[PDB]
Amino acid sequence: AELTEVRAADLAALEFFTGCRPSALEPLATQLRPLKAEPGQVLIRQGDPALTFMLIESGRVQVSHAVADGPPIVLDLIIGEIALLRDAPRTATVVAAEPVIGWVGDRDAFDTILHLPGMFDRLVRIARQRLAAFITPIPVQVRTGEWFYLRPVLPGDVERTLYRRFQSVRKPTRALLEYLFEVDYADHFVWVMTEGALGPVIADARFVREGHNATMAAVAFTVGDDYQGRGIGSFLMGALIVSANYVGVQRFNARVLTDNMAMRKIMDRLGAVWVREVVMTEVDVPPVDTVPFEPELIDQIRDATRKVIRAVSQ
Ligand SMILES: [Ca+2]
Ligand SMILES: [Ca+2]
Q: Is 212 helix (H, G, I), strand (E, B) or coil?
A: coil
Binding residues for 3',5'-cyclic AMP: 80-83, 90-91, 130
Sign of torsion over alpha carbons 265, 268, 272, 274: positive
Q: What are phi and psi of 147, to 5 degrees?
A: -95, 135
* Ligand 2 centroid, distance to 145 Cα (angstroms): 49
> How many domains are contained in the chain?
2
Residues 127 and 147 in one domain: no
Sign of torsion over alpha carbons 25, 27, 28, 34: positive
Query: What is the spatial distance between Cα 188 and Cα 208, in angstroms, rounded to a whole number?
Result: 4
Query: What is the spatial distance between Cα 154 and Cα 192, in angstroms, rounded to a whole number?
Result: 9
Residues 256 and 143 in one domain: yes
Query: What is the spatial distance between Cα 314 and Cα 302, in angstroms, rounded to a whole number?
Result: 15
Residues 129 and 158 in one domain: no
* Ligand 1 centroid, distance to 112 Cα (angstroms): 29
Domain containing residue 165: 138-314
DSSP-assigned letter for residue 5: H
Within 10 Å of residue 239's Cβ, how many Cβ atoms?
28
DSSP bridge partners of 78:
55
Sign of torsion over alpha carbons 107, 110, 116, 120: negative
Query: What is the spatial distance between Cα 5 and Cα 22, in angstroms, rounded to a whole number?
Result: 8
Residues 14 and 102 in one domain: yes
User: Which CATH number belongs to the domain containing residue 31 in this structure?
Assistant: 2.60.120.10
DSSP bridge partners of 252:
217, 283
* Ligand 2 centroid, distance to 87 Cα (angstroms): 5
Residues 75 and 102 in one domain: yes
Q: Is 149 helix (H, G, I), strand (E, B) or coil?
A: strand
| Ligand with smallest separation from the Cα of 135 | 1
Residues 290 and 156 in one domain: yes
Q: What are phi and psi of 39, to 5 degrees?
A: -55, 135
Contact, 82 vs 180, CB < 8 A? Answer: yes
Residues 29 and 160 in one domain: no
Binding residues for Mg(2+): 195
Query: What is the spatial distance between Cα 82 and Cα 159, in angstroms, rounded to a whole number?
Result: 21
Residues 43 and 170 in one domain: no
Residues 87 and 178 in one domain: no
Last residue of one domain, picked from the residues 137, 169, 204 = 137
Residues 37 and 159 in one domain: no
Residues 55 and 117 in one domain: yes
Query: What is the spatial distance between Cα 247 and Cα 304, in angstroms, rounded to a whole number?
Result: 12
Last residue of one domain, picked from the residues 99, 115, 137 = 137
Residues with CB under 5 A from ligand 2 (ion): 87, 170
* Ligand 1 centroid, distance to 97 Cα (angstroms): 26
Within 10 Å of residue 301's Cβ, how many Cβ atoms?
25
Q: How was this structure determined?
A: X-ray
User: Which CATH number belongs to the domain containing residue 259 in this structure?
Assistant: 3.40.630.30
Side chain identity, residue 235? F
Residues 51 and 188 in one domain: no
Q: List, in order, residues 6 or more apart from 34 with CB less than 8 Å away.
A: 7, 101, 102, 103, 104
| Ligand with smallest separation from the Cα of 196 | 1
* Ligand 2 centroid, distance to 171 Cα (angstroms): 7
Query: What is the spatial distance between Cα 111 and Cα 85, in angstroms, rounded to a whole number?
Result: 9
- Can you say whether residue 312 is alpha, beta or left, with left for phi > 0 and alpha for psi between -120 and 50 degrees? alpha
Contact, 6 vs 29, CB < 8 A? Answer: no
Last residue of one domain, picked from the residues 96, 118, 137 = 137
- The H or E element spanning position 255 is strand 251-256
Binding residues: 80-83, 90-91, 130, 195, 221-223, 229-234, 260, 269
